[PDB]
Amino acid sequence: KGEELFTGVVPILVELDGDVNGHKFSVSGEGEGDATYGKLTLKFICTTGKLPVPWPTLKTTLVQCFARYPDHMKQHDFFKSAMPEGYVQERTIFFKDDGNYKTRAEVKFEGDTLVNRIELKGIDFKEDGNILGHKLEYNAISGNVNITADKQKNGIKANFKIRHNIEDGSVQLADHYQQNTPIGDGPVLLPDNHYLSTQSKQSKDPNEKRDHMVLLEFVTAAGIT
Numbered sequence: 001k002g003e004e005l006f007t008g009v010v011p012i013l014v015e016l017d018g019d020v021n022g023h024k025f026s027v028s029g030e031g032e033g034d035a036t037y038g039k040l041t042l043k044f045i046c047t048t049g050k051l052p053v054p055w056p057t058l059k060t061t062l063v064q065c066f067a068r069y070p071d072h073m074k075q076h077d078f079f080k081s082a083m084p085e086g087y088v089q090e091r092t093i094f095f096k097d098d099g100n101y102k103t104r105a106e107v108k109f110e111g112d113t114l115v116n117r118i119e120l121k122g123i124d125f126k127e128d129g130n131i132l133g134h135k136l137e138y139n140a141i142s143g144n145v146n147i148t149a150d151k152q153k154n155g156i157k158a159n160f161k162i163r164h165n166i167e168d169g170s171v172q173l174a175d176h177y178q179q180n181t182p183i184g185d186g187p188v189l190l191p192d193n194h195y196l197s198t199q200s201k202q203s204k205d206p207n208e209k210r211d212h213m214v215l216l217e218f219v220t221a222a223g224i225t
């Protein structure tokens with residue numbers, strides 16, 4: 001039943017409240033997802049002024065229900081199966097030689113809109129590290145989300161690495177651990193091991209003077225032949 005809600009273009013809303021080393025900020029995002037093509041287009045705005053961390057570090061936090069699951073893998077799509085009641089998505093993101101983000105999000109339909117509502121808490125950051133020092137490039141992010149069933153929670157777990165380019169040519173590693181739990185009581189699809197091949201490009205709206213990020217993202221399930 002969940003999978004039927006994604007056969008067309010779906011409007012997306014993202015709302016994030018954050019506190020990173022006591023820097024409090026909010027982010028509002030809008031756009032649309034077409035799961036048939038694994039395609040997401042979004043624009044995010046910092047509504048509190050200047051974002052106190054680099055946009056790239058927030059990208060993974062700011063809707064894996066928009067993944068293109070190949071037909072032969074459709075029985076492994078936990079994300080859409082939880083809809084419309086939705087799922088809780090939790091992460092710890094460990095920035096190597098720096099702080100961590102912990103995130104708790106509720107992803108669900110509000111009428112015909114897919115909504116991602118997030119709380120983000122960041123601690124242990126260095127004031128002149130790559131995050132609070134704003135030393136990261138703004139360009140593109142890709143990786144493979146490794147998913148396994150979590151039957152004890154009627155949900156999934158995932159892990160993956162992101163390598164953020166630093167302006168010196170080096171990389172800032174962000175190790176991600178993830179847990180998803182259904183909000184509702186409907187049955188969900190507990191998957192075999194597989195991965196999401198995910199890539200996005202970050203850009204700027206030439207007309208936009210607010211602190212913002214434009215994103216074009218493609219997400220495809222794989223790793224079952």
Ligand SMILES: [Ca+2]
Nearest residue numbers: 054055056138
């Ligand atoms: Ca940035």
Ligand SMILES: [Ca+2]
Nearest residue numbers: 165168169170
């Ligand atoms: Ca380079």
Ligand code: NA
Nearest residue numbers: 008034035036
């Ligand atoms: Na679609």
